[PDB]
Ligand binder design. Sequence first.
Ligand SMILES: [Cl-]
Ligand SMILES: [Cl-]
Ligand SMILES: [Mg+2]
Ligand SMILES: [Mg+2]
Ligand SMILES: [Mg+2]
Ligand SMILES: [Mg+2]
Ligand SMILES: [Mg+2]
Ligand SMILES: [Mg+2]
Lengths: 293, 293
Amino acid sequence: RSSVRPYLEECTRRFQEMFDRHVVTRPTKVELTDAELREVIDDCNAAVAPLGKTVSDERWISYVGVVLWSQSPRHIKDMEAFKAVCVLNCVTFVWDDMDPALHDFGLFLPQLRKICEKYYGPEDAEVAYEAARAFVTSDHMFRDSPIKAALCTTSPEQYFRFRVTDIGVDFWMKMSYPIYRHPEFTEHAKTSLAARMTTRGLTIVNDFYSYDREVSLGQITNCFRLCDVSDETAFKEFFQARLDDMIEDIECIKAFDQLTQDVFLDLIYGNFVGTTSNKRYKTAVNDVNSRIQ
Amino acid sequence: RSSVRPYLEECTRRFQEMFDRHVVTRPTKVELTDAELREVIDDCNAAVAPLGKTVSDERWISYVGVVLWSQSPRHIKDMEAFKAVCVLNCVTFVWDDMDPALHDFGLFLPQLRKICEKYYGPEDAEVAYEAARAFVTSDHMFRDSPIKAALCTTSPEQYFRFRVTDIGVDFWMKMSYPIYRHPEFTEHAKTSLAARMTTRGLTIVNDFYSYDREVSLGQITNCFRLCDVSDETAFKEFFQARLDDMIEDIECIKAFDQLTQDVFLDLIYGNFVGTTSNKRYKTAVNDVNSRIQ
Ligand SMILES: [Cl-]
Ligand SMILES: [Cl-]
Ligand SMILES: [Mg+2]
Ligand SMILES: [Mg+2]
Ligand SMILES: [Mg+2]
Ligand SMILES: [Mg+2]
Ligand SMILES: [Mg+2]
Ligand SMILES: [Mg+2]
């Protein structure tokens, strides 16, 4: 029950086959200039310096790959907003990986605010800041919480309800809408409908590829802990139900306006492609994904 | 399929039996003083006056009943925040009942901001206003939207996902936390985990008692449209599935801290008690629930 290794090839193949059928349009990776990428990493290092833990360039590149693969390049209008999501994504990844003893809100929240005020106008900066604040506060609050155990062990419905916030997709939407300046997208981001539509597609994929690391760290936030991964028949049943969940969400995403659904589907499919390419999501513990103590 | 009247008595009885078994604590109606009720209704009339339609006192009292029944009186700490929620709930009910040709945002949004600035501190006022703005904007955007058709006709999971915003519970949470000044509750309100935990319990009850009215007005946002209510066997299997959903949520709510769960459960159970004594939720069309044209 400690590993999904036996299912790795087939589940990867099945994810891709599902995306080829239901999304069709391939995600595309954003290429940052060398100037852009050192500005991102500089800002990242400055923001986490108060917490006292060094983060290597290779670790930052592993965190940032998600942003590069899962945004929607055809619709990008504000690259300053794009760099903000790069920085905010990465530094909150450090926080997700940290022992809660290192979580210093008094030192870290000002740095998040500093990032938001650099890259966003005043209105957008407050929305992005509030969502960053809510994300790191939730991750901290729920470490060893009985609420988390209840929502993660009861049913898929309770679990994905927790993940709307905990995986950070609500935060992502609320800091990403300035990239696109698309009124419908902005409204769906601020109601969190955008986040709720994309939660299962992001979470099922992440869970599959982060399972071995998480169970080794005693982390319970993973939907495949709801099935006996040691029982191939039970596992494949559960995996098919999760594919069905993704498919229904994707088919409903296609009722949204064209630009909004492009972005939603680039997010889910791009996250999958970035995940299969990311050292973070291979070995259960390596030098880019080990717990920061 | 026009009516759930045949199931009225047994469904009411089953809801109450469920709450007696799973919640136990009875909800409590808040008494307002005469001066308090008058301040609330005056504020309501001033806020909707720019839209041109008179709203009777009896209609306001039908709207305000949900707030009086569904808050958590033992935990109340700020009766100014309480009156704000009365007013905000009531005037956005008028919006919910309006033909969208009456939806003047330029006239109505400044009235919502004025309400929030009268009753809340500066931070709280922004949060309450953002959520009121998001609520009235959503109701308007989704009148005859293909998104709403997709989410309301596909499955219960897509439907309740829409209702987290559309029924107004996220808005309710984000304008009610100042009533309690309870740090945990305030964080769950701001992540929307509060709203997600309580969405099905509010919606299933509201949908049952507003079905006849909504079907008569061509309104599709009602989960019992997903089953053939003219088929007694199918209706009862669908209704049991919805009771199971409510029970699962309630049992998970009990994992939250004591005050938060009191508030969450008072909301779900109080909304039911208020619904069963509210003239709005009887006749398909009467003089407190008719469409405002
Ligand atoms: Cl965890
Ligand atoms: Cl409707
Ligand atoms: Mg996490
Ligand atoms: Mg993690
Ligand atoms: Mg993970
Ligand atoms: Mg409505
Ligand atoms: Mg309505
Ligand atoms: Mg209704």
